[PDB]
C-alpha cells in the first residue's frame, strides 16, 4: 500500500560518499549541488553510515560542518534530512514544546497522524534523548480538552481492527449525535473517548452512519460544536482516520497556499514521510487540489532548497 519516494541506494559505498562530501566542503566556498544531490538520493539509514564514515576518515562531524557551510532554509532541510528517522518526530515535538513556546500546529499534526506503533516508538526515542517524559511535557504546556485529547492519543491505545459490529457502529454514531448536535453545549468527553480509542475501521463506519442519521459529516459537526485547538485537533484526528496521506497532503497544500510558505511544515512533512508514504501523499495531493505537489513546490520555493525539495518529492 504505502510508499515513500526515497529508497536505499544500490551500490552504496559509505566511504566514497564521505569523500565527496569532504571535497564539496573543503576550502573556500561550498558546492551545495553535490551535497544536495548526494543526500536526496541516499536513504536516512545510508546518511547515518555516511556520517559515520566521515567521522572515521576525517575526525570531523558531518552535520556540524554542514551547518557552518550552509545557511537558511536549505541548511534546515539538510539538517532535518540528516536527523535519524526514529528521532526526527521526537525532535520536532521537543522543539514545538519548548521554551515558553508551545506550537500546537506541530503537536496536533504529529500526534493526530502517527499510528499507535509510531507514538510508542516516538515516546521511547524522546525520553531516551531528552531526559524528560513526552506526556509530562505536553500536559505541562497544554490545557483543557485539547490537552486531554493529546494524552488519550499519547497512550497509543486505540482499539484493534477486528470485525465490525454494526450495533456498536449505531451506538457510537447516535452517542456523537446526542453529545453534540442534540446537546445544548457539547459533551467533549464523549467525542475524545470515541474518537480517541475506537479502532480505525470502526470509526470509518461510524462517520458514514453519523452522516446517515444526522445529515452532517462529522467534520461539520466538529466545526459547529467546538472552537480553537480542540476543533483543530479533532479535525486532524478525523482526517487521519479516513486517510493519513490525504490529511498530510492537505497540511502541505495549506502550508504553501497561504501567501508565504510555511517552510517549517514543508520541510517537516516532506522529510518525515519520504520513506513512509510520500508517494501516496503526492497521489492524494493530485486528486484533491488538481496540481502535482512538485509543481506547487517548484513555484513556492527557490534555490538549492527548491532543488533538493523537488528531488525528494519526485513526480512529473
- Which residues make up the interface to Ca ion (CB under 5 A)? 25, 30, 67, 71, 75, 102, 141, 143, 183, 186, 223, 227, 231, 256, 261, 300
Residue (141 or 250) nearer to Ca ion, CB: 141
For residues 86 and 257, which CB has a smaller minimum distance to Ca ion in the complex? Answer: 257
Measured from the CB atom, the residue of 5 and 186 that comes closer to Ca ion is 186
Work out how close the CB of 128 gets to Ca ion at its nearest, in angstroms, rounded to a whole number: 20
Interaxial angle between packed helices 72-82 and 62-69, expressed in degrees from 0 to 180 and rounded to the nearest 10: 170
Dist CA 49 CA 219 (whole Å): 45
Alpha-carbon distance of 164 to 48, in angstroms, equals: 43
At which residue does the C-alpha cell 499507535 appear? 116
Residue 83 CB, shortest distance to Ca ion, in Å, is 16
Contact 179, 163 (CB under 8 A): no
Indicate the residue among 71 and 212 with the shorter CB distance to Ca ion.
Answer: 71
Comparing CB distances to Ca ion, the nearer of 74 and 279 is: 74
Whichever of 6 and 248 has its CB closer to Ca ion, that residue is 248
Contact 276, 44 (CB under 8 A): no
Give yes or no for a contact between 284 and 246, defined as CB atoms under 8 angstroms apart. Answer: yes
Instruction: Answer whether 34's CB lies under 8 Å from 16's CB.
Output: no
First to last CA, the chain: 21
Least separation in angstroms between CB 54 and Ca ion: 14
**In the bound complex, what is the minimum distance in angstroms from residue 216's beta carbon to Ca ion?**
12
Least separation, in Å, of the C-beta of 58 and Ca ion?
Answer: 13
Question: What are the angstrom distances between the C-alpha of 114 and each of 107, 186, 250, 276?
Answer: 11, 27, 16, 11
Supply the minimum distance, in Å, between the C-beta of residue 100 and Ca ion.
6
| Rounded distance between C-alpha atoms, residue 72 and residue 25, angstroms | 17
Question: What's the length of the chain?
Answer: 316
Distance from C-alpha of 149 to C-alpha of 145, rounded to nearest angstrom: 6
**How far apart, in whole angstroms, are the C-alpha atoms of residue 222 and residue 47?**
42
Give the nearer residue to Ca ion in terms of CB position, either 52 or 231.
231
Question: Closest distance between Ca ion and the C-beta of residue 71, in Å?
Answer: 5
Amino acid at each position: 500500500a504505502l510508499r515513500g519516494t526515497v529508497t536505499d541506494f544500490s551500490g552504496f559505498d559509505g566511504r566514497a560518499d564521505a569523500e565527496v562530501l569532504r571535497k564539496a566542503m573543503k576550502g573556500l566556498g561550498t558546492d551545495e549541488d553535490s551535497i544536495l544531490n548526494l543526500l536526496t538520493a541516499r536513504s536516512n539509514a545510508q546518511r547515518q553510515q555516511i556520517a559515520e564514515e566521515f567521522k572515521t576518515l576525517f575526525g570531523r562531524d558531518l552535520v556540524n560542518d554542514m551547518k557552518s557551510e550552509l545557511t537558511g532554509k536549505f541548511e534546515k532541510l539538510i539538517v532535518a534530512l540528516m536527523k535519524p528517522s526514529r528521532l526526527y518526530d521526537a525532535y520536532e515535538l521537543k522543539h514545538a514544546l519548548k521554551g515558553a513556546g508551545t506550537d500546537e500546529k506541530v503537536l496536533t499534526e504529529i500526534i493526530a497522524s502517527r499510528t499507535p506503533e509510531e507514538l510508542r516508538a516516538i515516546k521511547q526515542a524522546y525520553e531516551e534523548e531528552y531526559g524528560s517524559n513526552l506526556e509530562d511535557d505536553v500536559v505541562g504546556d497544554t490545557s483543557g480538552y485539547y490537552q486531554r485529547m493529546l494524552v488519550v492519543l499519547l497512550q497509543a491505545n486505540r482499539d484493534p481492527d477486528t470485525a465490525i459490529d454494526d450495533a456498536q457502529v449505531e451506538l457510537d454514531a447516535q452517542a456523537l449525535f446526542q453529545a453534540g448536535e442534540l446537546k445544548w453545549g457539547t459533551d467533549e468527553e464523549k467525542f475524545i473517548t470515541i474518537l480517541g480509542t475506537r479502532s480505525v475501521s470502526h470509526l470509518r463506519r461510524v462517520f458514514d452512519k453519523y452522516m446517515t442519521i444526522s445529515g452532517f459529516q462529522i467534520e461539520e459537526t466538529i466545526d459547529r460544536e467546538t472552537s480553537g485547538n480542540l476543533e483543530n485537533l479533532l479535525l486532524a484526528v478525523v482526517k487521519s482516520i479516513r486517510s493519513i496521506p490525504a490529511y498530510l497532503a492537505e497540511t502541505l497544500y495549506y502550508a504553501m497556499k497561504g501567501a508565504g510558505t510555511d517552510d517549517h511544515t514543508l520541510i517537516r512533512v516532506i522529510v518525515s514521510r519520504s520513506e513512509i508514504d510520500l508517494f501516496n501523499i503526492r497521489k492524494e495531493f493530485r486528486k484533491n487540489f488538481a496540481t502535482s505537489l512538485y509543481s506547487m513546490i517548484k513555484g513556492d520555493t527557490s534555490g538549492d532548497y527548491k532543488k533538493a525539495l523537488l528531488l525528494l518529492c519526485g513526480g512529473e
